[PDB]
Amino acid sequence: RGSHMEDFVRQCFNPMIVELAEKAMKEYGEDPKIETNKFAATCTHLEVCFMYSDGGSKHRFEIIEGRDRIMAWTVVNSICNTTGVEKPKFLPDLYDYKENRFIEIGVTRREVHIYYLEKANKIKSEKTHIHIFSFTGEEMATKADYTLDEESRARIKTRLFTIRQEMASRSLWDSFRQSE
Numbered sequence: 001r002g003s004h005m006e007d008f009v010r011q012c013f014n015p016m017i018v019e020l021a022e023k024a025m026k027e028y029g030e031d032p033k034i035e036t037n038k039f040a041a042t043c044t045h046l047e048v049c050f051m052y053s054d055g056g057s058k059h060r061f062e063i064i065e066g067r068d069r070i071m072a073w074t075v076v077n078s079i080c081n082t083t084g085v086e087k088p089k090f091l092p093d094l095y096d097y098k099e100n101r102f103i104e105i106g107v108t109r110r111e112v113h114i115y116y117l118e119k120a121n122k123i124k125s126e127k128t129h130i131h132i133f134s135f136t137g138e139e140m141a142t143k144a145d146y147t148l149d150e151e152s153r154a155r156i157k158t159r160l161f162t163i164r165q166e167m168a169s170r171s172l173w174d175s176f177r178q179s180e
């Protein structure tokens, strides 16, 4: 209790995103009061996922991340049963109604190369698109198909570097980097 990471997450991120990240950690047996770095990562991942869905058209994306585990699996069943795409192994983040594929969003504190390899080895049915962002402004997507336009993607990298900057200004970034 009483971690600077917790008060920064509550001050930096959206109240709804903080609430959405708290439920996800509660449900998966984690405690944002103590597991404060994973609390900051869950909030960051949520925000990026929400800006990404805002980058396309109105009915472009279906948001999977940010729903309770049971409701998230229900909507992918409807997506699989009306489109014909195969059921993803683990839960993804989005679905592309324009490109007809699921999307896996990733935010990393390392080389964009390593994370995607990790995210690719657990989805052997490589039908799901994988998209990595980085806190240093680098990105990395499947088949070089970065899905969105450059302006929407650049907005994501800008916000990511602001979070890393605010984290470092409070001497929190060093603990956040050497923990992923």
Ligand SMILES: COc1cc(CCNC(=O)c2nc(-c3cccc(C(F)(F)F)c3)[nH]c(=O)c2O)ccn1
Binding pocket: 024, 025, 028, 030, 038, 041, 042, 045, 091, 092, 093, 104, 105, 106, 107
């Ligand atoms: C906190 O609730 C959870 C939930 C799960 C299963 C569901 N998870 C996802 O869907 C997911 N998780 C991450 C992620 C972010 C930081 C650290 C880690 C890891 F260190 F645990 F690997 C993963 N990034 C994504 O992009 C992503 O989609 C697992 C654990 N905790």
Ligand SMILES: [Mn+2]
Binding pocket: 065, 091, 092, 093
């Ligand atoms: Mn997810």
Ligand SMILES: [Mn+2]
Binding pocket: 045, 092, 093, 104, 105, 106
């Ligand atoms: Mn993800």
